[PDB]
Amino acid sequence: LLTIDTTIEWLGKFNEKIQENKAYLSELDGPIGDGDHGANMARGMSETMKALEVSNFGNVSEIFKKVAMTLMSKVGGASGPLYGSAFLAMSKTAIETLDTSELIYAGLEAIQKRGKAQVGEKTMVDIWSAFLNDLQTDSASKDNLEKVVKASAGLLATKGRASYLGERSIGHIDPGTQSSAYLFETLLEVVA
Amino acid sequence: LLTIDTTIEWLGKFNEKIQENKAYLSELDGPIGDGDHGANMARGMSETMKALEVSNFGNVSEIFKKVAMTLMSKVGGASGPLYGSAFLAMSKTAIETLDTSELIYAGLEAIQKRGKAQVGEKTMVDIWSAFLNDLQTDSASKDNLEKVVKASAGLLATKGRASYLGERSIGHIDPGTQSSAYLFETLLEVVA
Amino acid sequence: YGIVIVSHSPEIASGLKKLIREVAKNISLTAIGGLENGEIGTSFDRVMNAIEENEADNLLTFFDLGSARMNLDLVSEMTDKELTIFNVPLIEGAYTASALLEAGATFEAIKEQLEKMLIEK
Amino acid sequence: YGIVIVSHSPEIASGLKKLIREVAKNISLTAIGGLENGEIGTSFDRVMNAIEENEADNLLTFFDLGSARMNLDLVSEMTDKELTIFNVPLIEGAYTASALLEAGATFEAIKEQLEKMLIEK
Ligand SMILES: Nc1ncnc2c1ncn2[C@@H]1O[C@H](COP(=O)(O)OP(=O)(O)O)[C@@H](O)[C@H]1O
Ligand SMILES: Nc1ncnc2c1ncn2[C@@H]1O[C@H](COP(=O)(O)OP(=O)(O)O)[C@@H](O)[C@H]1O
Ligand SMILES: [Mg+2]
Ligand SMILES: [Mg+2]
Ligand SMILES: [Mg+2]
Ligand SMILES: [Mg+2]
């Protein structure tokens, strides 16, 4: 289970994956969006890591709450309300339990509530769901994460900016799905 | 039937009525529009009178085409396209005939084609149709024109800016119907 | 009652307010567009701001794209003001609601009219 | 193909083109609003010009209010350029057309999507 120190470790590694791959995420957001997802996430996570440095946390719930508010303020696209609400729910769950699948469950439920996406609609919901299912079957892995990211290409987008492209969204990897893969891949590294 | 001279007289008279009543026309356009009908028409008709001073027309058709194209350019709401199309059709008709009822017919037809309105929809169509039947039945009069202006108050607007107010458009005289009344009463003044 | 406009664009927000002011001079009206840097987008903070800036306690709200709606939803959950978020065209919906509100339409009649223009945002 | 936006507002027109340029950098895109003096309104001469100014010969066109439509319809009868006038929401409809056209959707496919969002203007 996560702790104050490994949570801060996890988010730092996530910020690193985000900064490293920011051009790629915005590239993914080109054919099926407005070409800003990487930029959006880089800003939000740079600001998040700044905000975590100056604060002194009593618990993990506090960390998640700080993540939620920073992303909600500093990300100007859909990923803001989405990740922000994911982290907010995880913040509330963390007061009572730091069980990894319980947290992810809180986050998924909140993303689905916020954006109203079902599984298979070509959004980050797809990987949040696949990753939780894997944790519940003790089969979560980076390989399985990458599988979901690649699988996102074949789907028709029915939510968000991508949905405006109809059939022309098929053949393009979803940027939020990719940024969510980085999230879980770094999680697995520190949590295992 | 109109001549070159009584056409120029008509339009000068019409312009005078518009300038003198521009505030009332915009006032009528308040509760069921954006409060500009008077100013659109005033703009359109001063420009039209300027245009007629600098030209030396060879027939009535030529005058109508000039009016048509000036109002199209210089009336800047819904009334421009409609009066514009009206005078343009009348221009074409004026080549074969200067029978007043045939001119009003062509005008009414172009307005209906342009704005898609039927009689009873609280627009200027209502008075163009009534004025036409009046000419045909040899019963056209000022009193019969005010009849239809006053009668527009109780019609539900199903076209134009007025239509956004639904039933809240009832109890309000249509500004386009009023400006078309001035058009027709000044015509009856000079046509005989 | 008041009207709130949320757009990805500061220019759309500004131009729509002016369009609307021509038919609704006296209504309580707020428009917000874009992020704090003038770039295209929407944020929780700015949506919340527009909600609290509006003089009214019961707010009819309008947006362009889905992520703007999400920010309205979030604000709705955090304010004691009563927000209705309408899944209708931004320009045409806000314009319809404002003109009606100016002219004295009831809330119910406005909603009746907006129900008629529901689009899959 | 080309996209023409016609608004009563210069700021809507400008804001909408910017929003759209984020998803359609390469399309022929013309956006006009307001009168010559920048006041709220629709100038026939500007609409006519904007149809000439666009480099394409088949034009997908969008408007806010009924009078804007009438200018488009007038201009349509006065050129050999093929105009389609879409009776759809200005922001949502123009955004949809522009995104689809940038991604290489056919005219027919764009029309099929826009038919889904027809409003009573
Ligand atoms: N309604 C939704 N539900 C769940 N996820 C969504 C929704 N809309 C968008 N997303 C996610 O957001 C990502 C795009 O994020 P970003 O580009 O930052 O926002 P925007 O689309 O506003 O520019 C998509 O790749 C998708 O995974
Ligand atoms: N579709 C239409 N068909 C016929 N007449 C119309 C139509 N739309 C508007 N009108 C007329 O135009 C008048 C409004 O003129 P004006 O205020 O100058 O234009 P706008 O409504 O664009 O500001 C109305 O009073 C009505 O008589
Ligand atoms: Mg994006
Ligand atoms: Mg964006
Ligand atoms: Mg008007
Ligand atoms: Mg007007």
XYZ file of C-alpha atoms and ligand atoms in Angstrom:
684
model
C 0.000 0.000 0.000
C 1.048 3.613 -0.540
C 2.507 5.835 2.159
C 3.260 9.589 2.297
C 6.798 8.965 1.008
C 5.946 6.449 -1.755
C 2.945 8.516 -2.860
C 5.249 11.514 -3.289
C 7.750 9.200 -5.000
C 4.986 7.894 -7.321
C 3.736 11.311 -8.381
C 7.330 12.476 -8.992
C 7.960 9.533 -11.337
C 4.599 10.236 -13.018
C 5.540 13.920 -13.490
C 8.822 12.663 -15.033
C 7.024 10.392 -17.539
C 4.692 13.304 -18.329
C 7.507 15.841 -18.943
C 9.506 13.283 -20.950
C 6.584 12.347 -23.200
C 4.739 15.691 -23.457
C 5.270 16.258 -27.198
C 4.071 12.675 -27.811
C 0.859 13.167 -25.798
C 0.008 16.380 -27.653
C 0.826 14.528 -30.907
C -1.726 11.895 -29.979
C -4.157 14.799 -29.296
C -3.669 16.134 -32.845
C -5.690 13.847 -35.159
C -8.411 13.410 -32.560
C -8.307 16.634 -30.556
C -6.740 20.065 -30.245
C -3.091 19.013 -29.846
C -2.657 20.111 -26.210
C -2.955 17.056 -23.898
C 0.809 16.760 -23.273
C 1.155 20.522 -22.702
C -1.923 20.400 -20.377
C -0.552 17.523 -18.285
C 3.013 18.948 -18.201
C 1.729 22.227 -16.754
C -0.595 20.502 -14.299
C 2.006 18.047 -13.047
C 4.847 20.603 -12.879
C 2.546 22.797 -10.789
C 1.477 19.738 -8.740
C 5.082 18.832 -7.872
C 5.786 22.492 -6.972
C 2.737 22.566 -4.674
C 3.725 19.268 -3.005
C 7.223 20.630 -2.188
C 6.025 23.651 -0.150
C 3.351 21.722 1.751
C 3.876 19.369 4.696
C 1.480 16.416 4.664
C -0.106 14.667 7.630
C -1.435 11.859 5.443
C -1.968 10.446 1.930
C -5.536 11.841 1.695
C -4.007 15.355 2.002
C -1.616 14.631 -0.887
C -4.424 13.492 -3.199
C -6.528 16.552 -2.245
C -3.594 18.827 -3.177
C -3.172 16.976 -6.484
C -6.890 17.305 -7.245
C -7.000 21.103 -6.646
C -3.755 21.817 -8.530
C -4.858 19.842 -11.629
C -8.340 21.431 -11.448
C -6.836 24.935 -11.507
C -3.844 24.499 -13.846
C -5.193 22.144 -16.599
C -7.498 23.986 -19.066
C -8.939 20.928 -20.849
C -11.153 17.938 -20.012
C -8.250 16.127 -18.334
C -8.431 18.726 -15.495
C -11.959 17.995 -14.221
C -11.275 14.289 -14.923
C -7.958 13.669 -13.141
C -8.980 16.301 -10.542
C -12.174 14.424 -9.687
C -10.281 11.105 -9.768
C -7.808 12.438 -7.208
C -10.539 14.068 -5.114
C -12.377 10.754 -4.699
C -9.057 9.011 -3.972
C -8.422 11.686 -1.354
C -11.727 10.851 0.351
C -11.159 7.065 0.134
C -7.579 7.457 1.517
C -8.876 8.773 4.878
C -10.152 5.261 5.575
C -8.077 2.917 3.370
C -4.917 2.970 1.255
C -5.732 -0.341 -0.478
C -4.579 0.149 -4.072
C -7.618 -1.327 -5.855
C -10.007 0.605 -3.530
C -8.263 3.871 -4.526
C -8.336 3.104 -8.243
C -11.999 2.155 -7.827
C -12.716 5.535 -6.226
C -10.866 7.293 -9.098
C -12.641 5.331 -11.872
C -16.086 5.865 -10.348
C -15.362 9.606 -10.155
C -14.091 9.866 -13.779
C -17.166 8.006 -14.969
C -19.421 10.292 -12.893
C -17.675 13.419 -14.219
C -17.422 12.663 -17.948
C -20.214 10.004 -18.151
C -18.069 7.635 -20.232
C -18.730 3.915 -20.408
C -15.930 1.405 -20.879
C -15.065 1.078 -24.601
C -15.745 4.685 -25.488
C -12.061 5.414 -26.239
C -11.154 7.411 -23.125
C -8.933 7.007 -20.023
C -11.943 5.217 -18.442
C -10.895 2.197 -20.549
C -7.495 1.868 -18.927
C -8.683 2.800 -15.406
C -11.193 -0.068 -15.714
C -8.740 -2.541 -17.281
C -6.117 -1.724 -14.634
C -8.552 -2.197 -11.709
C -9.788 -5.476 -13.183
C -6.126 -6.608 -13.365
C -5.448 -5.607 -9.730
C -8.568 -7.560 -8.657
C -7.222 -10.620 -10.492
C -3.624 -9.985 -9.353
C -2.458 -9.607 -12.952
C -1.586 -5.906 -13.253
C 1.499 -5.202 -15.356
C 3.185 -2.653 -17.616
C 2.708 -5.085 -20.526
C -1.055 -5.208 -19.837
C -1.168 -1.405 -19.602
C 0.565 -1.002 -22.991
C -1.911 -3.522 -24.467
C -4.856 -1.251 -23.492
C -3.109 1.837 -24.904
C -2.574 0.143 -28.274
C -6.136 -1.218 -28.194
C -7.447 2.332 -27.839
C -6.566 2.931 -31.503
C -9.214 0.501 -32.851
C -12.079 2.152 -30.955
C -14.597 4.707 -32.239
C -14.415 7.832 -30.088
C -17.816 8.612 -28.620
C -16.756 11.124 -25.937
C -14.821 14.383 -25.784
C -13.265 16.284 -28.676
C -12.291 13.019 -30.417
C -15.959 12.113 -30.865
C -16.341 15.020 -33.345
C -14.212 13.045 -35.808
C -16.561 10.044 -36.007
C -15.012 7.172 -38.026
C -11.855 9.292 -38.594
C -10.982 8.715 -34.880
C -10.370 5.007 -35.583
C -6.645 4.306 -35.991
C -5.517 6.905 -33.439
C -4.306 6.169 -29.902
C -6.245 8.136 -27.223
C -3.993 10.678 -25.430
C -5.736 10.447 -22.003
C -5.431 6.641 -22.174
C -1.676 7.073 -22.698
C -1.255 9.603 -19.912
C -3.222 7.216 -17.639
C -0.838 4.380 -18.611
C 2.116 6.477 -17.383
C 0.211 7.001 -14.131
C -0.304 3.295 -13.455
C 3.058 2.145 -14.767
C 4.819 4.452 -12.252
C 2.357 3.309 -9.569
C 3.296 -0.348 -10.200
C 7.011 0.539 -9.913
C 6.675 1.905 -6.367
C 3.807 -0.248 -5.126
C 4.198 -3.703 -6.767
C -49.372 53.136 -62.815
C -46.062 54.479 -61.465
C -43.796 56.468 -63.759
C -40.105 57.426 -63.340
C -41.272 60.645 -61.652
C -43.947 59.227 -59.321
C -41.515 56.431 -58.379
C -38.896 58.978 -57.292
C -41.679 60.949 -55.529
C -42.892 57.786 -53.774
C -39.430 56.878 -52.490
C -38.660 60.412 -51.289
C -42.020 60.406 -49.484
C -41.250 56.914 -48.050
C -37.827 58.107 -46.864
C -39.488 61.098 -45.147
C -41.922 58.812 -43.264
C -39.023 56.549 -42.188
C -36.798 59.430 -40.948
C -39.713 61.022 -39.072
C -40.714 57.718 -37.490
C -37.330 55.995 -36.986
C -37.574 56.154 -33.151
C -41.082 54.627 -33.050
C -40.013 51.811 -35.406
C -37.035 50.966 -33.160
C -39.321 51.282 -30.117
C -41.657 48.660 -31.660
C -38.547 46.500 -32.212
C -37.807 46.637 -28.451
C -40.067 44.097 -26.752
C -39.946 41.680 -29.728
C -36.486 42.472 -31.208
C -33.121 44.176 -30.712
C -34.526 47.727 -30.923
C -33.042 48.723 -34.281
C -35.685 48.477 -37.068
C -36.013 52.292 -37.207
C -32.249 52.820 -37.424
C -31.766 50.074 -40.089
C -34.472 51.568 -42.314
C -33.301 55.181 -41.730
C -29.775 54.190 -42.743
C -31.042 52.204 -45.738
C -33.317 54.933 -47.067
C -30.965 57.954 -46.711
C -28.344 55.939 -48.641
C -31.042 55.032 -51.187
C -31.995 58.715 -51.677
C -28.288 59.601 -52.053
C -27.993 56.877 -54.706
C -31.006 58.216 -56.636
C -29.607 61.786 -56.742
C -26.450 60.757 -58.599
C -28.175 58.627 -61.251
C -30.249 59.362 -64.373
C -32.600 56.402 -64.837
C -33.976 55.330 -68.215
C -36.954 53.419 -66.730
C -38.707 52.412 -63.468
C -37.021 48.958 -63.467
C -33.652 50.679 -63.197
C -34.839 52.666 -60.172
C -36.085 49.491 -58.463
C -32.777 47.662 -59.055
C -30.845 50.583 -57.530
C -33.180 50.621 -54.507
C -32.881 46.823 -54.224
C -29.083 46.845 -54.176
C -28.756 49.819 -51.835
C -31.161 48.409 -49.227
C -29.408 45.046 -49.471
C -26.109 46.775 -48.736
C -27.309 49.449 -46.283
C -30.147 47.905 -44.236
C -28.290 45.685 -41.726
C -30.827 43.312 -40.157
C -33.509 40.976 -41.522
C -35.337 43.873 -43.263
C -32.465 44.552 -45.712
C -32.506 41.138 -47.469
C -36.332 41.203 -47.507
C -36.926 44.734 -48.863
C -33.914 44.156 -51.091
C -35.363 40.970 -52.592
C -38.762 42.707 -52.832
C -37.413 45.599 -54.918
C -35.197 43.305 -56.983
C -38.170 41.148 -58.035
C -40.159 44.360 -58.683
C -37.268 45.549 -60.860
C -37.618 42.462 -63.037
C -41.423 42.771 -63.163
C -41.222 46.524 -63.989
C -39.643 45.559 -67.352
C -42.901 44.004 -68.564
C -45.492 45.863 -66.510
C -45.978 48.773 -64.119
C -49.373 47.546 -62.919
C -49.192 48.204 -59.146
C -50.834 44.928 -58.075
C -48.392 42.963 -60.311
C -45.441 44.829 -58.697
C -46.704 44.147 -55.168
C -47.320 40.486 -56.163
C -43.717 40.079 -57.312
C -42.517 41.855 -54.142
C -44.652 39.711 -51.802
C -43.445 36.559 -53.590
C -39.752 37.441 -53.208
C -40.253 38.315 -49.493
C -41.981 34.959 -48.843
C -39.229 33.112 -50.737
C -36.495 34.954 -48.839
C -37.807 34.702 -45.269
C -40.069 31.635 -45.744
C -42.984 33.279 -43.891
C -46.673 32.679 -44.495
C -49.478 35.097 -43.768
C -50.320 35.017 -40.056
C -46.741 34.732 -38.733
C -46.454 38.355 -37.521
C -44.209 39.741 -40.243
C -44.384 42.288 -43.042
C -45.665 39.428 -45.237
C -49.007 39.966 -43.465
C -49.380 43.496 -44.837
C -47.886 42.837 -48.309
C -50.525 40.140 -48.733
C -53.341 42.321 -47.398
C -52.236 45.321 -49.500
C -52.107 43.144 -52.629
C -55.666 41.786 -52.089
C -56.794 45.384 -51.438
C -55.356 46.605 -54.776
C -56.863 43.593 -56.620
C -60.302 44.229 -55.081
C -59.842 47.972 -55.759
C -60.211 48.737 -52.023
C -56.711 49.911 -50.952
C -56.684 52.681 -48.326
C -54.612 54.093 -45.472
C -57.220 52.910 -42.934
C -56.944 49.361 -44.331
C -53.165 49.520 -43.800
C -53.406 50.666 -40.165
C -55.946 47.852 -39.734
C -53.221 45.266 -40.474
C -50.535 47.098 -38.457
C -52.787 47.114 -35.392
C -53.790 43.501 -36.181
C -50.134 42.350 -36.008
C -50.138 42.914 -32.204
C -52.268 39.824 -31.580
C -50.383 37.503 -33.912
C -47.911 35.001 -32.494
C -44.441 35.569 -34.024
C -43.167 32.359 -35.525
C -40.459 34.084 -37.651
C -37.510 36.448 -37.015
C -36.155 37.826 -33.735
C -39.744 38.208 -32.484
C -40.213 34.435 -32.588
C -37.727 33.864 -29.722
C -40.261 35.415 -27.355
C -42.997 32.832 -28.110
C -46.295 34.001 -26.612
C -44.477 36.999 -25.103
C -44.651 38.463 -28.638
C -48.424 38.805 -28.329
C -49.526 42.337 -27.457
C -46.787 43.829 -29.606
C -47.056 45.443 -33.056
C -44.571 44.081 -35.617
C -42.030 46.776 -36.645
C -41.595 45.357 -40.182
C -45.361 45.468 -40.660
C -45.302 49.144 -39.611
C -42.474 50.128 -41.990
C -44.268 48.347 -44.903
C -47.422 50.339 -44.036
C -45.482 53.595 -44.540
C -44.196 52.146 -47.814
C -47.724 51.465 -49.071
C -49.438 54.643 -47.804
C -46.821 56.830 -49.491
C -47.298 54.715 -52.635
C -51.084 55.346 -52.586
C -50.336 59.074 -52.115
C -48.443 59.309 -55.386
C -49.806 56.531 -57.628
C -53.512 57.534 -57.843
C -32.659 34.496 -11.994
C -29.559 35.226 -14.050
C -27.731 33.957 -17.136
C -24.148 32.567 -17.196
C -22.126 31.960 -20.388
C -19.089 29.664 -20.319
C -16.906 29.402 -23.423
C -13.489 28.117 -24.383
C -13.009 31.578 -25.958
C -12.865 34.999 -24.253
C -13.877 36.596 -27.563
C -16.939 34.358 -27.973
C -17.906 35.100 -24.359
C -17.525 38.850 -24.911
C -19.248 38.970 -28.307
C -22.167 36.784 -27.136
C -22.745 39.032 -24.106
C -22.973 42.046 -26.449
C -25.285 40.244 -28.874
C -27.494 39.357 -25.898
C -27.380 42.860 -24.346
C -29.241 44.192 -27.424
C -32.315 42.086 -26.456
C -31.764 41.799 -22.712
C -30.468 45.085 -21.240
C -31.606 44.545 -17.654
C -31.061 40.867 -16.880
C -28.363 39.589 -14.544
C -25.741 38.381 -17.027
C -22.193 36.960 -16.709
C -19.924 35.603 -19.442
C -16.552 33.905 -19.043
C -14.236 32.608 -21.734
C -10.789 31.068 -21.899
C -8.053 30.534 -19.359
C -6.234 33.125 -17.217
C -3.540 33.523 -19.927
C -5.930 34.368 -22.750
C -5.476 30.866 -24.230
C -8.405 28.721 -25.383
C -9.893 26.640 -22.529
C -12.004 26.651 -19.365
C -11.234 26.250 -15.644
C -13.036 25.494 -12.404
C -11.754 28.756 -10.880
C -13.086 31.015 -13.630
C -16.434 29.195 -13.909
C -16.804 29.495 -10.099
C -15.885 33.197 -10.376
C -18.601 33.917 -12.993
C -21.162 32.070 -10.843
C -20.301 34.152 -7.756
C -20.008 37.395 -9.769
C -23.619 37.002 -11.012
C -26.057 38.891 -8.727
C -28.709 36.171 -8.982
C -29.128 33.034 -6.818
C -30.780 30.881 -9.513
C -28.561 30.547 -12.599
C -29.388 29.358 -16.114
C -26.030 28.211 -17.485
C -24.690 27.685 -21.038
C -21.467 26.194 -22.452
C -19.817 25.370 -25.783
C -17.969 22.033 -25.400
C -18.197 19.091 -22.948
C -15.219 20.048 -20.772
C -16.866 23.452 -20.108
C -19.969 21.525 -18.997
C -17.825 19.446 -16.610
C -16.571 22.632 -14.982
C -20.163 23.889 -14.652
C -21.134 20.540 -13.078
C -18.265 20.776 -10.584
C -19.249 24.342 -9.623
C -22.909 23.330 -9.275
C -21.847 20.731 -6.683
C -19.896 23.328 -4.682
C -22.223 26.317 -4.616
C -25.411 27.101 -2.708
C -26.661 28.933 -5.800
C -29.060 26.858 -7.900
C -27.569 26.103 -11.314
C -29.351 24.685 -14.278
C -26.999 23.563 -17.007
C -28.649 23.410 -20.406
C -27.437 20.949 -23.053
C -28.287 23.340 -25.860
C -26.372 25.474 -28.423
C -24.348 28.178 -26.679
C -25.292 31.165 -28.855
C -28.836 30.166 -29.751
C -29.681 28.705 -26.312
C -28.254 31.559 -24.236
C -29.896 34.050 -26.625
C -33.270 32.326 -26.334
C -33.078 32.191 -22.530
C -31.951 35.817 -22.133
C -34.592 37.348 -24.464
C -37.306 35.362 -22.728
C -35.967 36.323 -19.297
C -35.890 40.047 -20.234
C -39.489 39.806 -21.517
C -40.750 38.308 -18.264
C -40.999 34.612 -19.125
C -41.259 32.245 -16.131
C -38.434 29.804 -15.404
C -40.751 26.980 -16.410
C -41.590 28.545 -19.800
C -37.864 29.193 -20.483
C -37.014 25.556 -19.652
C -39.958 24.475 -21.846
C -38.392 26.422 -24.710
C -34.853 25.112 -24.091
C -36.071 21.473 -23.886
C -36.964 21.980 -27.555
C -33.363 22.546 -28.606
C -31.556 19.694 -26.884
C -28.365 18.607 -28.630
C -25.851 15.817 -27.954
C -22.981 17.883 -26.535
C -13.990 22.729 -49.782
C -14.054 25.728 -47.420
C -15.808 26.869 -44.222
C -17.490 30.265 -43.878
C -18.750 31.573 -40.540
C -21.160 34.501 -40.422
C -22.035 36.198 -37.134
C -23.713 39.349 -35.836
C -20.593 39.782 -33.680
C -16.969 40.456 -34.707
C -15.758 38.862 -31.448
C -17.789 35.661 -31.853
C -16.419 35.337 -35.402
C -12.833 35.846 -34.221
C -13.204 33.661 -31.121
C -14.775 30.863 -33.151
C -12.061 30.885 -35.814
C -9.424 30.607 -33.051
C -11.229 27.732 -31.332
C -11.527 25.994 -34.697
C -7.911 26.693 -35.745
C -6.876 24.436 -32.785
C -8.516 21.448 -34.563
C -8.305 22.561 -38.185
C -5.035 24.335 -38.945
C -5.070 23.628 -42.697
C -8.629 24.162 -43.947
C -9.871 27.176 -45.941
C -11.635 29.087 -43.176
C -13.323 32.484 -43.295
C -15.016 34.035 -40.269
C -16.863 37.373 -40.378
C -18.953 39.249 -37.830
C -20.616 42.600 -37.289
C -20.842 45.768 -39.329
C -18.099 47.784 -41.047
C -17.854 49.932 -37.898
C -17.579 46.815 -35.669
C -21.047 47.242 -34.179
C -23.317 44.195 -33.727
C -25.068 43.420 -37.065
C -24.794 41.674 -40.462
C -23.402 43.461 -43.533
C -24.358 41.937 -46.908
C -21.243 43.447 -48.516
C -18.986 41.735 -45.931
C -20.783 38.370 -46.444
C -20.435 38.700 -50.229
C -16.755 39.603 -49.837
C -16.142 36.690 -47.443
C -17.542 34.252 -49.981
C -15.200 35.700 -52.628
C -12.259 35.813 -50.148
C -12.433 32.126 -49.296
C -10.239 30.193 -51.705
C -12.564 27.209 -52.080
C -15.376 26.881 -54.642
C -17.650 24.665 -52.523
C -18.529 26.373 -49.255
C -19.966 24.983 -46.038
C -21.539 27.987 -44.341
C -22.721 28.741 -40.816
C -24.630 31.616 -39.195
C -25.985 32.666 -35.818
C -29.390 34.346 -36.388
C -31.988 34.289 -39.204
C -30.864 37.546 -40.866
C -27.331 36.187 -41.197
C -28.800 33.209 -42.984
C -30.630 35.493 -45.434
C -27.392 37.221 -46.420
C -25.863 33.796 -47.034
C -28.893 32.783 -49.128
C -28.766 36.071 -51.130
C -25.038 35.585 -51.808
C -25.699 31.947 -52.806
C -27.935 33.113 -55.676
C -25.270 35.608 -56.722
C -22.243 33.346 -57.266
C -21.220 30.181 -59.118
C -19.572 28.958 -55.900
C -21.548 26.145 -54.378
C -22.801 27.170 -50.948
C -24.482 24.900 -48.447
C -26.252 26.749 -45.661
C -26.450 24.602 -42.566
C -29.329 25.329 -40.239
C -27.319 24.164 -37.252
C -25.781 25.816 -34.129
C -23.032 28.218 -35.150
C -20.344 27.154 -32.686
C -21.140 23.482 -32.428
C -21.953 23.059 -36.148
C -18.983 25.027 -37.502
C -16.659 23.281 -35.021
C -17.985 19.873 -36.183
C -17.671 20.635 -39.895
C -14.155 22.097 -39.527
C -12.815 19.181 -37.433
C -14.290 16.637 -39.843
C -12.987 18.474 -42.924
C -9.481 18.798 -41.431
C -9.425 15.002 -40.734
C -10.400 14.301 -44.361
C -14.064 13.326 -43.993
C -16.057 13.602 -47.239
C -18.659 16.288 -47.937
C -21.411 13.653 -47.636
C -20.094 12.442 -44.262
C -20.007 16.025 -42.936
C -23.567 16.641 -44.180
C -24.761 13.414 -42.493
C -23.335 14.591 -39.146
C -24.756 18.123 -39.497
C -28.197 16.794 -40.448
C -28.274 15.273 -36.934
C -28.180 18.748 -35.340
C -30.851 20.715 -37.228
C -32.534 23.527 -35.300
C -35.605 25.770 -35.815
C -34.030 29.145 -36.644
N -16.201 12.643 -21.304
C -15.025 12.056 -21.008
N -14.922 11.020 -20.145
C -13.740 10.453 -19.834
N -12.587 10.869 -20.360
C -12.551 11.903 -21.248
C -13.790 12.574 -21.622
N -13.488 13.555 -22.494
C -12.159 13.528 -22.675
N -11.603 12.552 -21.925
C -10.161 12.249 -21.885
O -9.459 13.482 -22.005
C -8.433 13.345 -22.996
C -8.128 14.665 -23.672
O -7.527 15.518 -22.692
P -7.089 17.024 -23.074
O -6.560 17.055 -24.467
O -6.166 17.537 -21.993
O -8.516 17.788 -22.957
P -9.343 18.503 -24.155
O -9.982 17.366 -24.954
O -10.337 19.365 -23.455
O -8.330 19.284 -24.929
C -8.948 12.290 -23.959
O -7.836 11.623 -24.557
C -9.787 11.372 -23.073
O -9.042 10.272 -22.545
N -38.429 35.408 -41.994
C -39.044 36.603 -42.160
N -39.974 36.797 -43.116
C -40.593 37.984 -43.294
N -40.341 39.079 -42.555
C -39.429 39.027 -41.559
C -38.711 37.765 -41.302
N -37.873 37.994 -40.285
C -38.037 39.283 -39.918
N -38.959 39.903 -40.673
C -39.372 41.326 -40.557
O -38.228 42.138 -40.193
C -38.566 42.967 -39.078
C -37.338 43.179 -38.196
O -36.503 44.115 -38.889
P -35.105 44.597 -38.274
O -35.364 44.908 -36.820
O -34.512 45.679 -39.140
O -34.180 43.263 -38.412
P -33.604 42.394 -37.173
O -34.794 41.621 -36.620
O -32.567 41.577 -37.878
O -33.002 43.435 -36.235
C -39.728 42.260 -38.376
O -40.577 43.201 -37.698
C -40.434 41.470 -39.477
O -41.566 42.148 -40.033
Mg -6.644 18.514 -25.902
Mg -8.145 21.744 -24.813
Mg -34.153 44.483 -35.166
Mg -30.925 43.682 -36.000
